[PDB]
Write an enzyme that holds these catalytic residues in place. Structure first.
Site, PDB file in Angstrom:
ATOM      1  N   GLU A 109       0.836  -1.238   0.000  1.00 14.91           N
ATOM      2  CA  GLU A 109       0.000   0.000   0.000  1.00 14.91           C
ATOM      3  C   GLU A 109       0.866   1.281   0.000  1.00 14.91           C
ATOM      4  OE1 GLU A 109      -3.609  -1.383   2.841  1.00 14.91           O
ATOM      5  OE2 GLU A 109      -4.084  -0.318   1.034  1.00 14.91           O
ATOM      6  N   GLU A 129      -3.887  -9.516   3.209  1.00 13.56           N
ATOM      7  CA  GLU A 129      -4.941  -9.123   4.187  1.00 13.56           C
ATOM      8  C   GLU A 129      -6.138 -10.072   4.073  1.00 13.56           C
ATOM      9  OE1 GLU A 129      -2.931  -6.974   2.632  1.00 13.56           O
ATOM     10  OE2 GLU A 129      -2.431  -5.367   4.123  1.00 13.56           O
TER      11      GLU A 129
END
Lengths: 259, 259, 259
Positions: A109, A129
């Site tokens: 990210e 995730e």
């Protein structure tokens, strides 16, 4: 005199270039909350320091960054600019990621919102995730849709699997893939090219590139750049030095920006 | 007990994966108004059925789908979600297109909005609407601009010609090109990977990916995902199972989503 | 009877295709303010002339266009549609760039907003504005973000260096790279394919492609195309000729558009 970062190194390849080296490869270069905050303060310094023109972030060993310290998270608000100040950064000056290995979760990210991305052949990218019962909510999902396209962002984010440097170059995020030995030199070469340009020109270009991600229409973005920045750029001592150098047929001598 | 679709087959590669097979290759897998409506009802079921995690659409023979039944259209409102419920779908759960042959007109408008696209080497893609005096108005044009880029969407849509699987992979829509023998297995492998993840995580990831196509700015999309979904995800039994599995160093046992 | 352009040639590969040839290679095909205005008037004619369906722009020698005449600029408002009417054009009919050499500064800002781009192998692309103390403010920055992705637009615009035709094809802007001998024929082949389609269909397709760059959401763009254009397209003599040709199993005979 520069800010320090626990578990990291702060150095200057040239007087105009800042390098952050993530230096806890023994923990896969995961970033604690305290380290994240110290990196955010380094970028605040970087953005505000008129003599710094470009920054680089890189890792060590076989890890770029495997994201947040999960031991610490297990024992947590999600806001801008986010982990290490990168996922939701709106930068005044460009940051280059030099991805030397595992780039996972919060670490990916981070990279999805860096200005330029170069990677070694051994680098890998993923958002695991979804495999652990959480989701990539640091700001990468809409950004990856806009860089990779919906279907490639979907395959990465929905699967949670790892993808190669070569795949992320074919798909649009990684500018260049190079041998690991050449990774930092390649990032420094690109940073050096940018650092030779007018600091005012680089500030206005960053604004114009941002408006592309901020406004519904390319015409609103086009008008905004002219309306907000064109007069200020042409008023600057750097623009007049550019014109003296053209007329006189010599090299321009730039000064730091106030924009 | 599952909905049926006239001219199609409904099957389950695993208990968590739905496969729709377009099964009228003798008519180039064109879709009648009645078939279109029955496919829309199958996706309504799919989206609502908590135990189904991922869907696949594929064709038969040398056709994926050549679009609407033109004999029927010759003897017609354009709305969301559109032909076979795909061109203007805003899905809660991902649909993978496995393109096995001709993917033309409404059939290409279907695929342009699927979450993941895999294609056999023999597949071809086109919007021949412009050659017949109509236009691709099912919702693909703005979506193709955002996946392929303006100039590639323009070449396809303005020319009305056919383009190869390999071209649509180089241009960004097709995730993978594989030999025809391997097409369905490849789609099932990707679906299986997604189906192993937390059903709550997959729902929230789908929302975040959608906001990338729905909001003017990447920051509005980033804030929206956190504000609307982060608390709900962390409240779920699946998130707590993810954390028990981490602490206990074992595999997580997921439950279907209520999100 | 056609408009003329100082320093350029205006010709018609077919009765439905306009070619503009930039014809001052001795000055790297830089465009004076007066030439820019005359090119804008040619596109006004082109857009309004019902019998013209597609246009091409190309250069001569080793230059496509090195941008604005810098001698003249040194002795300057930035508005739509901009230099030679291209960077911020919102066209009713498509313009193809055939890039035969240096495509720099304003010349690259022109090409970034053309509908289709083909390039010879020797073509090169760059925005050297940042090296001279100004910035690319003609409208390319948000457009390049949407075609190349943020990180590739950033590398080009922040560095100010030159990039090859092959690089700009891998990165998404250039539809095709061909040998220099084949450049104009390739542009004409694509234009001819588009020119054979219904002129009404091409107008509505252009609108749908534009909405992709104009509206925050793909659904607003999808609704807008149906609401504004679908009834008008189906009312046209061309649509009825398309349906007579289908039913009668013969080739359609198109008329110029009034849309």
């Amino acid at each position: 005199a520069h800010p320090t970062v626990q578990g990291c190194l702060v150095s200057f390849p040239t007087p105009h270039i800042l390098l952050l080296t993530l230096n806890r490869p023994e923990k896969r270069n995961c970033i604690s909350l305290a380290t994240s905050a110290e990196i955010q303060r380094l970028w605040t310094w970087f953005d505000t320091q008129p003599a710094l023109y470009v920054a680089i972030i890189t890792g060590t060993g076989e890890s770029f960054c495997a994201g947040a310290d999960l031991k610490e998270w297990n024992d947590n608000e999600m806001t801008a600019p986010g982990l290490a100040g990168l996922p939701r950064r709106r930068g005044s000056k460009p940051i280059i990621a030099a991805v030397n290995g595992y780039c996972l979760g919060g670490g990916f990210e981070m990279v999805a919102n860096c200005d330029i991305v170069v990677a070694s052949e051994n680098a890998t990218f993923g958002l695991p995730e979804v495999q652990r019962g959480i989701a990539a909510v640091a700001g990468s999902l809409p950004r990856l849709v806009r860089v990779l396209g919906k279907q490639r962002a979907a395959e990465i984010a929905l699967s949670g699997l790892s993808f190669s440097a070569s795949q992320l170059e074919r798909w649009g995020l990684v500018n260049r893939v190079v041998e690991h030995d050449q990774l930092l030199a390649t990032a420094v070469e690109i940073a050096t090219a940018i650092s030779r340009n007018s600091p005012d020109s680089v500030r206005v270009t960053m604004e114009g590139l941002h408006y592309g991600w901020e406004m519904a229409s390319v015409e609103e973005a086009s008008s905004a750049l002219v309306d907000q920045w064109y007069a200020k750029l042409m008023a600057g001592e750097n623009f007049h030095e550019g014109v003296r150098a053209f007329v006189e047929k010599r090299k321009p001598q730039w000064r730091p920006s106030k924009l």
